[model samples]
Target: AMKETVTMLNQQYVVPEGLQPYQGVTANSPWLASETEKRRRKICDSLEEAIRRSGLKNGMTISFHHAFRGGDKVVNMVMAKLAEMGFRDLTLASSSLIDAHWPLIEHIKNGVVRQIYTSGLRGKLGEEISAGLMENPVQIHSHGGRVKLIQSGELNIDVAFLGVPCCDEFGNANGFSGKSRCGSLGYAQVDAQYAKCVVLLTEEWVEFPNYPASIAQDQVDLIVQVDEVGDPEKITAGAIRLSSNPRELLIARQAANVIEHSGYFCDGFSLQTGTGGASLAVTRFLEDKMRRHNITASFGLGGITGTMVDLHEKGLIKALLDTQSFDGDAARSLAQNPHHIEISTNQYANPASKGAACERLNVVMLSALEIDVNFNVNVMTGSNGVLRGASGGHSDTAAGADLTIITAPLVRGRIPCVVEKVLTTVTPGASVDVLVTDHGIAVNPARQDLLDNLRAAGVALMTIEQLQQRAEQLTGKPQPIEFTDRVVAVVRYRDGSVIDVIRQVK
Candidate 1:
């Protein structure tokens, strides 16, 4: 019987006969390639020809990475070429989409792209999607959720067209050496591993044995040299920024103080933080505390930053576990530093993996759009009822870290962020531990121990209701957002359960 079934995390997979999961997984030999052999293959004259070779067809799913953010020329370039080929009904499973990908609209409108899956979307495409423009609603997943879906074969990828900064003739590639260096090809590492057909598209060609190869020769199926991959300046093109706002600075300092008193600020603790202005700014505040208290973080996990690189240089954090890098300096660090490294999406956040580093996390700094009286947080949809936000690692880290702290301004331009009930629940309140706004601090009642600790540390606390009321007093509560009967998108938990549904805005 060739039809065998494999089970993982209660998900059944129907596979082939006697197909051992570890069958022939060992590597034993190296190819002694002649220059003549190297010159004969692995080079494609054009993307159209490469598409022909990959056997791309209508309705099959193809993927790309957004490491370059708005500077990404790969996704739009590939989609435009695919549209030129008269391809239709395709699914674009990009890791995420940004303003640079607005050209995707024509592909979708022309029936060339029928579906989409991504962590976040913005600009013209976001507006169109929110206006109910998609014939098929967009599917949004947390980084962890996407990784889980890919591993379980629920969203099998047919072809992956990944853009790296540099590659050799034999397809050894990295993100460090090219003209448009978008650091830490962390998001693409998983696609290189599991995609049915993997193609490396690069503008910069280097010698063979490209040092510190992020995508090795064996994993890539072909190589295509383009005029340019992207602009290096756009590596941090998305909304992530180092803050200068005094409000944000104050919040960061207070958040660091909370962490200092939380009893998790010991030697050899593991930590992670989102890239929001306040969350990222917390590192600057914590550095002084680390020196004063003589504390050194054992390891930092997730989305490595230049700040963490400085800490690694000074021996504050022992190691950086990056599933993605946010800046060019961080990418260059990956190019040179062996200790500051890239990790697979699975190893970074997959809950089904054997004890993810996230589970062992001691503390995590997060951001919130709208937290309710019940403490449920909503970052998926906005108060105006638009699909402008992302289901990032916010929930994953909260669920994993021993103490999860969310920080935000009390209000955003007359819009109260803390509400009576969240517009949509992205993370259950039970997973969150503490909330710090410019106005006051609130600890989850379930974590009375943390409450006592902060109280004893002389940290004045307020009820979530008090915080919400204070915001409402200033901004005045507006009417709730309305939605039609149709479901626009379903947000999933990392465990694959439906957390909430985004409805068609009416």
Candidate 2:
């Protein structure tokens, strides 16, 4: 009876049973005949008709990729049409939610969307969710976790609406062509494989047998043409800008100094940094040292940024293991450079997989909201128990890297960075090796060997206890954040590991 029940749920949820093989010919293969002679055919029509033919209905799960960054129009265009059709209780599964998705607030209030499962939510969407505007709390996961969720039958997709820059008549597509060329369709690859129904929305419709297709025709069921999928300019915006603030520069210099003094600063070493202002600033400092020491990196990881592209261009880095491109420079780099390779969530960080990319990383620079005496880091909640940030790839790469260094300010607003215990633990203290702030540096107790090596290399090293003392001396110990025990979201480490829980604000 249990087996029967499971089967019924599987059928009810409309999950795809198995993966399909690629059917199109590779670029090296012989040239095919004209599009009409090919097996697949393209149609020039409206998006509404294509969605209708794909059989979108109430309560169905639809997924979208954010490769377009801040200028994604496909989601808004499709959702508005779906809402107009009176579709209710729909599940919106997006790679990440940005400010452009703020229009979804009205849909949520109108009961058009029942639940949201995304990697990150920012801008107005975050503000609305924090204010308790929605009926159900959003479930957030990293790229790896999202893939795991679908593969493990936890979050089955009903229909996947893919926004492509170019598609062949047979529905083969890629992001390297068309007017909106945001490189690397890594996030959509999994969706195409597992979705019950796959719909391709594109403005550039090529003939059958699209050349160099990132997604093959066998995986896609329907193709639709639209006026525009996304804006190329928005796709490249915010690529290499660095923070000009004196304080951030000081923090970056201090972190760079620590890396230089540590033995980990060697040729062929790899590192991962965030796209934050401070993190970008640190890249510049690190770049100077890498050139000075004549060291070249094996690869840089995480969201590819303009700084990473610059390094790749200078031959200071051999490759970029890109999960997502954060700005136009990175996207342009992915298009032109062979060194910038796209990797899916599972290959990027899934710890439960046979082998994850994070396991091979040497150094990872991260940001944090709070750090406790125990050294556990919190990247999830703010001082008031509001969801201000996300776990992202924080714990995944940190645990896998040889040296994990966290850079943060001593205080943010009135809240101190150091506390007796973090409100939440997004990353285990054991995984973190070093903590660098504007005031001092803290070495974890677990990395006695690292401390010894750093000390021998004349690196400025202070104990975690000492850093906490200085924080307290400067800002006084901050009062603990009070919260009720309602779990709003679960933070997943890149390896499909549940590292921590976030409580909803009462």
Candidate 3:
């Protein structure tokens, strides 16, 4: 008993000022198993095992991020495995969908995906959905709007299959390293935070303590070691091509000129550029004007593009608020540049947030499929009435930015782009400030200040009505696109309001 007392004193009693003595531990089987399992478990052999173990079942919603866009492999791969396992009636909520997701059409036909919610859709999958492949209408929300919906519990995610370039054994992951770096886990970050279970699909394994993790281990539930999560080249393929088309070039220059004369071209002004031949070209066009005028942008926002990176490297823009990296250079810059910060979609454009990056914008340039005399924009449908485009950040930025400029050609292949009324009002007229087409620049009548500013700068302006008439003269007022009564998709605004609905193509 005296020896036992001595042993306890030596083991449990601390002599040091700050350090406590180690106590002898009892052999507890459950704790031992738990600690061992915690450090050793979570990593599944394949996606099939991960899905089977993630508590996912029929009627549950599974989410994905399109950070890799056209190069993503995990979406189709996981869907295939889910179908193979005979899971039915799953709702797919993705940040976006592109041409690479065409294979999902078959999955939809097989009823693996019974419902859909996404920011945008493209390629054959979009066309099939437009043709009313499923009974349910696809719910299309903005990037920031998607996060809001998730947080509001309007769109619940049972499992989030996030594809990371690399991750630690504990599930800490990021998109800025390894073989298939997509960069900026902005969209994925939201899903990880809100999803009930987060399954990280990664290609490269890293050492423990994956510092500065985009998706932290605490939010992650499972990890799947995949052979490849995405293709690096295909991830940004055709996303950042410079404009050589004359019409696109003309529209880009006109948009750039409008931005210069709009009185928003100040030293500390911030801006955002979208992904289009013209929208991307506007960045290039601005470089010369910014340098000549000695005006420097405080920051640039949205998907960080290579041209935006070039401007940042050249010190024309001080910081880049990157919600998504649009190219290899932007991805690499996120890894290297201190000022190029990655932010979640909620921080990027969520309307319910305290403040979003878009709200701080002095200017924003966007592309459009159609713009009406009312200045309402449509980026979701084609002239043929197929859902071939995406909602993206169009309405969010338009509503947020102080100066919103839309760029598009007056006519596309004999189809009038400026119509009497947009086929679908994606962004309301009250949000759009200016419309820049190849033929003329039209300032929204709501912004008298912009009209005065542009006119004073000797920039000739056309009314939205005049521009619409000119487009009609060129294209000869297009025949109305036929559609069925069945609504194919519900377009939700940033604040979760139903702005429009896409009807099934007849």
Candidate 4:
């Protein structure tokens, strides 16, 4: 395997070119770039037939997307079909994994699936993997890193099984026009672009030329019309409400205040936030501040929520750069409001782009499972070091944003959050800046200007070590965890660098 020296976000990495699990597609050829294939093939009756038609073998790789969150049906259906076909040692490369994809455990045990690669995992699949059940460790990559891998020929995919709301016979698919309407098909565009074969599955088959297609007809190899691709309720969470938790509200207020006075919340400022208690609440607080200060955001990025949609609707936000919609309200807004735009993962955080949108982001609100004194974050594992959380857009926006603020409680249960080191570093401390906790706020020492700004703004701040001591004083120090020699997972940063490895727990 060859390696390339690439520089991004003022950091360098020797990225390996070994797309081992998908070696059948390393060469940069025509990519079956002819509409002739689309014209020649029609819908397949079963997943088993599609596998052979797509040229899937025992040692090849397949990919999937998780737009449906906890209610996806495509992954399990394809895997079950693959198992029935007697496939072995295949790799499960998905944009993301969730609680609903638990049936993967049996596939692993049957030796039908020997390798796994995804952003995160939970439910039965996560528990079995944490129990060290797999013969080979999984490889995890961030959202942008997954795109980077495929674009750089690092993880060539043999087949990509993507689900859509509707697609015509010629394979022009859209995610917003069927019984199971997921708002954005952003993640699937990358898989469709690079995979050797593409299979578009849908429940609703629309008329010829399903224009305004998230996936073009040229990229599709075949189409499959199934009864159902996903549960509609799982596609987007229903109506969302503001948080009433006192602790969460206070933390969100503090975070909003931090951003307001950090000298970045000016007119035309841009920001990104997650769907956590504090992160989502930040939007609520910022909305009031925006109205008071006459500040209007230029754009909001990442997975969108109804709160952001409200801001956009109220003339406070100019536009929304959505990679995924978090709720039903946001999905409806995408269908109606032209300002609520859907974008691709590559366009959202392509490291190779000279001026990626994340690079210009003013502020981003993120949550963490654990943050160390060095400011490194571990979202992948609990204190027990299980593969529970996904990288999402954590690393991409953290390193990209001018100000990255992480919000979490000082301690979760009896476990101290501000530790000497994280269990597994998903996002390095070098890219992080501000920490907002219920106990106190800590600014990374690297940003002396931000520290001074916080102080001048009358914001109480402490050193990272001081916060750690306060947390330790409350919850006592935790004992070290024991691990076996066999690694359970390898987590890669956005540039495809090995940030940390998760060993099998003993």
Candidate 5:
């Protein structure tokens, strides 16, 4: 039979028979508490020991983040250690791989790594892979697509070795401190949340709590201190700069002019810009217009740059949602400025996110290696059919922003940028709204309203075909790049759909 008990509201409630009475609370002894703290710490003697304890085995996927970009020491260091441990056929999954990752070629050849998944591939490593170095084709995914794949269980990570600039004994870490500060650890946050085991590779060990951590201690399983996790200086080694090139400056001016008349340049509008000469310099040209119109952007999104940071400090841009900090100024600003906030890659642009930051974007300025007459853009491969660039936020922002403007020169050293067809399409033509080049501006035919506005503003306009024609006239027709039937990489769009594939160079 049930027993009766009085509820907090004075109503009779049924209580289970044989229920035990509450016991009085008591604090643990200081010695016991200290012992518990020691037991709770996740310190590991070496990277090898951590890897061994992580239960990592052959053929399992291991991931890393490129928040440090080219200055990263974690990827190469970890891969070498894995090889030294005699691990074989591991899947190397990085948020992105850069020129500094050339050492991976030896790992691939030695059968230590069998597959790769990344947002981009660059330098000698990319060239070797393009020449058919591996049996498995690389999967090139957008930042958003990569996060989606992890969410859908398509890319399961067994162990993630994340390199943070600073952390505490229990593994609460952040990228905004110490000698190797790489800024927002957006990419690493994803790995920490989803990977089966998360290891923190740090250079500096601070006190417990490591407050306001980007990667909280609960998600971390191990911590290994190294001499240096990355070189802060190299983090921005090949990053964008404020341009002095006259032609690039001209394109930036024209792109800014297009934004001014595109009907999206108003108070509280949000925008993102790329790390290219014209795109980075677009902020330079827009500052005057923004001040003149008394317009302050609601937010500046994506990889935060010094130019964007300067605007926020001046009250022209209200907030910055940084997924990856592009330079030292941007990294330092994250720690000093209250309005500049770090965001995860999923929150920044993942199409599957409930409300992605890019989804609310009003305007965005992008750069291109190649854009065709149909307005399809290519930021993945070079003219020689080699992987050289990245698909970072390009398609995601293009689809999200009200007005997407791509800025590039008509030609680069006699190579046409605007062509009959791009070698590979990373962003579909439909998402693209406007093309701004040094030669002229081309509005996508679908955006008639934008065309009319630009026309009324007396801005010189040309059809995409016309721009391609002009570029061809100057550069002449380029020889077609030959490739074998083998697919070297599969390019995934922001929505996790296959947009195109890169073939192996002949």
Candidate 6:
């Protein structure tokens, strides 16, 4: 027995070999300096020649950033030229789509754009997509997923067209030093790094090696000095206004209550609220609670806003994790506050690579168009079968956060918030923990402990099935959504895993 227990072994472990070598940029290469100079010189003579030299082609993936938000003119200008040139089947790969690009509706109808992939979709484009007018279903991804896709060669960018506030001849660009100083070019930085060809369109063209460059010169291939990239006035428009609706305020209050009752409301907790009206409103209510409880949030996550700025100013939130700035207040915060840090898509929600910031989030308030009995959510479509929204970071944060809450009214118009099943599954049911509607709050059975705690805390709790019944009773059971079998887009989890498919509307 002693001899059997005394056995000792010495072994050497060998590291696996056959690692792949790093491949140089072979697709989108930097243009010859002379060629770039030639294009710049031709712009003084013929604008068309400059565009031609920039290699504008049909069916090419032309990308843009949402730094200018509603004030963007670069997309319209480039699209107008592409339309005039009769370029068809072009793929628009924008970081996000806003209402400012409504002109693209005609382009989609005229077959100019065959497909699209972006972080979010809204306004007329969303309406059109929902109405089954688009030939291809739109692919929606989180900011992080977009970056991963581009970097991993899953979505190859043919031409990255950026609208910079300021840029030099060598293509050093920054957002904080121009007429339209929409700070934080976080989304574009990924595009500049991974795109096959980088084209910088800016009105403020400085000398070579622009100081404090957000985008480096080595990544840029072409620079086109435009008359104006966007309207500064519209860029700073009320992009982040608070909601005035009483129902939204109630929902926001309830969401705040839910967070407060949850164990995550303690000091040094982290929270994330989306840009939706209700979600943003939650911040105001949460701020009040934080001050009352004398608690300071460790950080605020997602797109920064004025409400978040207020909290940061009041010392309710210690820091901000900003991946994108949605409004002027956010832009100002990025410039003025040192605690407001910028992050790329991967750091925000890449599930497969390394641990994401979302993993550390305590509470995340999200919006949903429809939530099923199983608590599966659809943020991508409406009852009318129109594309009205995007996945953004919904699935990423929901899967990562400790307590994920969906806040919506019991009903919207004739549509019921709680249903037997969601029309489209954008975020899986497994990730969702709570559904806070005007009618009542539903907890996923998997979170029985949370349900027990909420009940003990005098918080209202109901099963998802019970919420569905209540919603049906209040709104009269909603008619089933009609859809087609032709899949338009495949919704991906943060790990680059295909989770659900968004089929085309029949």
Cα RMSD for candidates in order: 6.7, 7.8, 5.7, 9.4, 4.4, 9.5
Q: Which ten residues in a row have the lowest lDDT in candidate 6?
A: 2-11
Ranking by lDDT: 5, 3, 4, 1, 2, 6
Q: Give the TM-scores of the predictions, in the order they appear.
A: 0.91, 0.86, 0.92, 0.91, 0.92, 0.84
- What ranges in model 1 sit over 4 Å off? 1-40, 236-242
lDDT of 6 by residue, 32-139 (tens): 345655434323223355567667777778888887877788888888878888889988989888887889999888888998988777898776676576767777
lDDT of model 6 at residue 254? 87
The CA lDDT at 404 in model 5 is 90
The whole-model lDDT of each prediction reads: 0.83, 0.79, 0.87, 0.85, 0.88, 0.78
* Candidate 3: residue 208 lDDT (0-100): 90
Residue-wise lDDT of candidate 1 within 327-445, one digit each (tens)?
77677776678788788777777777675778889999988889988888898777877877778777888898999998989999978878888877888899999889999889999
lDDT of 3 by residue, 1-506 (tens): 25556666667877544433445453333444466775857888878889888999899999999887677888988988898899889999988988888889888888898999987888888889888898999999888788889889999999999999899999899887676888888999999999999999999889997866999989988998887778866663434578789888998888899999888898989999876678889988899999999899999999988889889989999999998998888888888999999999889999987779899999999988898998889988888889888888888888899999988888888888899987777889899999988889998898999989999999998888888888888888577878989999998988899999999999
Better of 1 and 3 by lDDT: 3
Instruction: Count clashing residue pairs per candidate.
Output: 0, 3, 0, 0, 0, 4
Residue lDDT tens for model 2, 94-212: 87877788889999999999998888777777767766766666777766678778888878898888899898888889787786777778788888888998888887878767866
Candidate 4 residue pairs in clash (backbone atoms < 3 Å): none
**Model 6: pairs clashing at backbone N, Cα or C within 3 Å:** 28-196, 130-386, 130-387, 144-345
- Greater-lDDT candidate between 2 and 6: 2
Q: How does model 6 fare in lDDT?
A: 0.78
For candidate 6, the C-alpha RMSD (Å) to the true structure equals 9.5
